[PDB]
Paper text:
We thus used a random approach by screening drug libraries and successfully obtained three inhibitor compounds MMV1, MMV3, and MMV12. Furthermore, we report the discovery of the first known CntA inhibitors and solve the structure of CntA in complex with the inhibitor, demonstrating the pivotal role of Y203 through a π–π stacking interaction with the inhibitor. Interestingly, Tyr203 and Tyr295, both of which are important for the coordination of carnitine in CntA, also play a key role in binding to the inhibitor. Tyr203 forms a π–π stacking interaction with the 1,6-naphthyridine core ring, and Tyr295 forms polar interaction with the oxygen on the methoxy group in the inhibitor. Interestingly, the inhibitor is also coordinated to the mononuclear Fe via a nitrogen on the 1,6-naphthyridine ring at distance of 2.65 Å and to an oxygen of the carboxylic acid moiety of Asp323 at 2.7 Å. Other π–π interactions are also observed between Phe319 and the phenyl methoxy group and between Phe258/Phe247 and the imidazole group. When the binding pockets of carnitine and MMV12 are compared, Phe258 moves to accommodate the imidazole group of the inhibitor, whereas the loop containing Phe216 is drawn in closer to the active site to form the π–π interaction with the inhibitor. Cocrystallization of the substrates and the competitive inhibitor with CntA unveils the role of the π–π stacking interaction as the key mode of inhibition. The data presented here suggest that CntA substrate analogs are less likely to inhibit its activity and rational drug design should perhaps take advantage of the presence of several aromatic residues in the binding pocket to utilize a π–π stacking interaction as we have demonstrated in the inhibitor compound.
The carnitine monooxygenase (CntA) and associated reductase (CntB) responsible for carnitine oxidation to TMA was originally identified in Acinetobacter spp. but was subsequently found to be present in a range of gut microbiota species. CntA belongs to a large group of non-heme-iron–containing Rieske oxygenase family. The oxygenase component has a conserved [2Fe-2S] Rieske center coordinated by two cysteine and two histidine residues and a catalytic mononuclear iron (Fe) center. We observed a head-to-tail α3 trimeric structure for CntA, with the Rieske [2Fe-2S] cluster and mononuclear Fe center at opposing regions of the monomer 44 Å apart.
Numbering used by the authors:
A (entry chain A): 3 to 243, 253 to 371
B (entry chain C): 3 to 242, 255 to 371
C (entry chain B): 3 to 243, 256 to 371
Write the structure that this text describes.
């Protein structure tokens, strides 16, 4: 039996509850979200700086797919499943500059940076060798809002159709997105469903108790969480200890988050690549405009690494454990207040209302 | 198809065999035993001393359930599923002294030590906020025989209904139970079905060959294993005569009162899955500060005695999956019911068999 | 629906493709290969040198079965499931010289080295104790080509029926096989289907790119892969500044007689599940006291040669689960059947295919 949700699930944030627990734990729900959501949506994978020059490539894994994204010699950005068409060896590893051809490690077939088979060894002596159908298998990729998105659906349109208006507002909050460079990346296999991790991001109800260092840097009467078109913006004014330093927190469907902290001069990005119902690989990327980091930046990197990020990781991990309990009645009340203050949870209701549309 | 046993399974200990091997390995058998037995029986979790003072609390995990047991400000012992009613964060960790209210770490809802929602931050501004229906979810707990039992079955009666006479007999074996204090705990995730570990305890057929260091005290002809009602007693006199008690109680807690009757060890089996059982091996002394002779005995249990029994049940769990294991094992019951008779296994499995009709 | 193949699957190596990817990943396909192939075929486990003397024994694990192969008092080689018939404890571990009877470590039942029950403690006072049928459970074992093969099918015939002509030809490749002794064993749990590891051994298409240090001996001009009857031979001439043999035998044991013909390496594959295969990589020399050249070569295999092949099969296992991998891979057979032809794969897979009708 398949679990289904109503169309109006969390349609009313003022009186709303989180998903029945099975949606956070069921492997069958995950397998449905994997193909209905993560194989048919634009999945953000990197900032443009990782792929800015010809021959630049990166590799990612999401929902079990090892994918390579590569800027071809023609400067055309492409993405491919990272698997040789001869006998399935992976083609590239890590990140870097590709040679002028991709040489598979197992039998040294070569491919052009557009996936075309360049040379199959001993090809000429193999009967009825299919040169056309021995090329790398592509998927869609789009450079959007200064970042890179992939899509496994061959019939997808463009990122703007998925996140209407998002590219312009993000560039409004940070005017140096195009000069950012990856300063630090935190990689964690998190034992929480991807939806639990989004829930946590979508509210600051927990900042008082769970985030001491991120609690004075934020005004509760000067904090607004507005929903948009498959994304939301959490905006507020800071004063930890520019007559009004602002901060931005974007959530975009399905689960990528873009943060522009006070100053608007750098970004952190949360990438969620789901693994299974109770596992989500996370990239926590910190981006600065300078390549050689000052020590105030290196300290900031370690503060997120060792103090700030561990707090949210424990939260989502404990929640994943708790909601399997028979002592958890099943659903959790979303603490929306009618003024949408800085500790209102209504943003969770907006996210989950979108998720619910995939469970009819 | 679900496995089942004749209700007369091991009804005759003189001619009996262990479960067909699938009962030790099948996930569908385990999931049935998990709910039919471990979610509906009294599960011993601690000695009372761990919960003797107001605000004292402990946490246990059993059959996938994180449970908190907590002595309220009002001195009333209660138990709760260890999960906040708002959005599922765990409430307490480890063991110790709870504050006067429980503060959930995620959104800082407050709960009185009886589970009551005290204050949910900003509730007053949340439409249609439910007062209780947002309280901690409790489960039954009872102090019995000086120990603490929990029960996830809301319609369970009392521990005495489950173990008729056990409190009476254990208090005759050790008269200082309430003065006991936890001296040491061995936590082991053991890769054996919980029933393999009970099988192991229910017989001394193996003590000669498998426990060399535990042979210089026991007497083979002054050893008796008598069955009662959902518990059994292994009773004997030890080489000088000091007596000793080995209680097994349904489903899988064992209480040992070694010679001297002044201390106890207790085996708690918290099953995890068909082939995994969390074990607490607790040693309890009446004194707070351990002597160095007590630390040595603790060490012997930890490094010599317990490894022998853990190795046996781990090896058996592997071996009974072999296609070369014909399926069932003969229970070595003798007419005399000697110090090495295995008939106690038949009593244990006959009760288990009643849950597989 | 269960996955099936045409009988002519890879019957024509000139126009052939590897299995549809489900055959390398499906646990149902594995369970069928497990029982149709690995429980009914002769499985090579060791060289004779390990079991040459009375009471010598080894232990192996393959397809979930812990097996002991033991040379009886009477110099008769036997194989048994390594599980006591009483209550399932394992009987022996590792390799070594067994004592005149096997004494189980749980209840000290004794067995003779031919599997018969010697003495079951207290049996005399146990009602209806079955002495015949309280035996170690045997399985078939055969010494062939200087090696030892087991078979879980008690109606199995002999290894020659499985590998017709193999011993004859192997003894021509290495004339001192009976003089070999185990110098080194690399045990690796490999996350690849057993068939992926065979596919890899069956071709030298990959030696140029994947084995740089192994490239001066791999000459396409002087390298032949001929198929026979459930085994194949990759024979070539090496370049110094001498011939070499590489036998694959059904289902998955590979015997290498490298240049010089004075030593052997052997690849034993013991599949675990669809995506896990335990491998033994055995290096055999005739002398017991290794020289530094031999000690250096063992480490070259351990740190240089074998890691390259292990990475190849591990990446392939990952890659063929990709939705970007079209079902099957083209087997690169060339008309000449050169040293880089992949036709050996088609021979192997056509045989496998016979078990998937
Ligand atoms: C170092 O960057 C990060 C990265 C992640 C976050 C972050 C962490 N945890 C929970 C959260 C909930 C909500 C939000 C949000 O609504 N977004 C912005 C608010 C936080 N902000 C401060 C300055 N700029 C943004 N962020 C959260 C903050 C800072
Ligand atoms: C001290 O804690 C343990 C913990 C585990 C055991 C234990 C382990 N395995 C099998 C067993 C069979 C029978 C019995 C028994 O008769 N138990 C009663 C007191 C035995 N006693 C004598 C001297 N010291 C202790 N115990 C067994 C004993 C003792
Ligand atoms: C020395 O032991 C090993 C052990 C493993 C191999 C080996 C490993 N991987 C792929 C392979 C493909 C083909 C062949 C072959 O052609 N095998 C025949 C013996 C050729 N020879 C070379 C050096 N010495 C002997 N071997 C492969 C070779 C040698
Ligand atoms: S896998 Fe054979 S060439 Fe890439
Ligand atoms: S989860 Fe306990 S307060 Fe929100
Ligand atoms: S288990 Fe081997 S003798 Fe009892
Ligand atoms: Fe947070
Ligand atoms: Fe014991
Ligand atoms: Fe190789």
């Amino acid at each position: 039996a398949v679990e289904k949700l109503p169309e109006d699930f969390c349609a009313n944030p003022d009186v709303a509850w989180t998903f029945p627990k099975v949606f956070y734990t069921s492997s069958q729900v995950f397998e449905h979200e994997k193909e209905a959501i993560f194989a048919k949506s634009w999945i953000c994978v990197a900032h443009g700086s990782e792929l800015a020059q010809p021959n630049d490539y990166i590799t990612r894994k999401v929902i079990g797919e090892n994918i390579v994204i590569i800027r071809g010699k023609d400067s055309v950005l492409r993405a491919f499943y990272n698997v040789c068409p001869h006998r399935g060896h992976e083609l590239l590893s890590g990140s870097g500059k590709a040679k002028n051809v991709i040489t598979c490690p197992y039998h040294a077939w070569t491919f052009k940076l557009d996936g075309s088979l360049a040379l199959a060894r001993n090809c000429d002596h193999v009967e009825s060798f299919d040169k056309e159908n021995s090329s790398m298998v592509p998927l869609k990729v789009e450079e959007y809002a200064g970042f890179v998105f992939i899509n496994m659906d061959e019939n997808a349109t463009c990122v703007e159709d998925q996140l209407p208006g998002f590219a312009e507002r993000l560039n409004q909050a940070c005017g140096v997105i195009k000069d950012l460079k990856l300063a630090a990346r935190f990689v964690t296999e998190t034992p929480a469903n991807w939806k639990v991790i989004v829930d946590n991001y979508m509210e600051c109800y927990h900042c008082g108790p769970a985030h001491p260092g991120f609690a004075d840097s934020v005004q509760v009467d000067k904090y607004w969480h507005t929903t948009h078109q498959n994304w939301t913006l959490q905006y507020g004014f800071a004063r930890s200890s520019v007559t009004d330093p602002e901060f931005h927190g974007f959530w975009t469907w399905p689960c990528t988050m873009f943060n522009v902290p006070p100053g608007s001069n750098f970004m952190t990005v949360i990438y969620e690549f789901p693994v299974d119902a109770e596992t989500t690989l996370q990239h926590y990327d910190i981006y600065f405009t300078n390549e050689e980091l000052t020590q105030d930046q290196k300290d900031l990197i370690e503060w997120y690494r060792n103090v700030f990020r561990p707090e949210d990781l424990n939260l989502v991990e404990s929640v994943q454990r708790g909601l399997k309990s028979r002592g958890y009645r099943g659903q959790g009340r979303i603490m929306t207040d009618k003024q949408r203050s800085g500790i209102s949870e209504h943003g969770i209701a907006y996210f989950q209302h979108l998720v619910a549309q995939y469970h009819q």
